[PDB]
Amino acid sequence: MAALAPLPPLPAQFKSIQHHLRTAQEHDKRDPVVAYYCRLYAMQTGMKIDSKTPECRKFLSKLMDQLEALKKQLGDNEAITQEIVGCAHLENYALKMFLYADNEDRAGRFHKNMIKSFYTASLLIDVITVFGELTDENVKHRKYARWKATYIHNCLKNGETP
């Protein structure tokens, strides 16, 4: 599968999975396991939202093409064959970014990397629903991270200090 292999335009109704798909593309070489589950979350969320409008069914079909392609590429990778190994992989990576961004936050260092790490950590917790229900701790870290990210971002956007 090509780097940045294009899907058809994203249906307006799937606007809520836009950033999960972007995260997938950004990890397509760095970490195909993350890229795979990010797409899986987007597929599975898309189906629940609208799987009968034609545009959406087209989009979903193309997305499954990339999933199937990537499952092929990954083969006997344990993070794919064993869900819980995939879950631990994503969870450890989400926590890594969260602890990174949190450390920056506590030091008063506010910048694009710490903002993106907060928001990606929350996107990864979304993705972790494909392994089962979120824990109370997942839910709190997700909310916390989304808040810091959009808040710090909007401050800096408007020349204010958070």
Binding site: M47, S61, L67, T81
Partner: peptide, 13 residues
């Protein structure tokens, strides 16, 4: 539903 089955096959079940 063609989709639903590809998903089930994707997730090895």
């Amino acid at each position: 539903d063609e989709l639903s089955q590809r998903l089930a096959r994707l997730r090895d079940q």
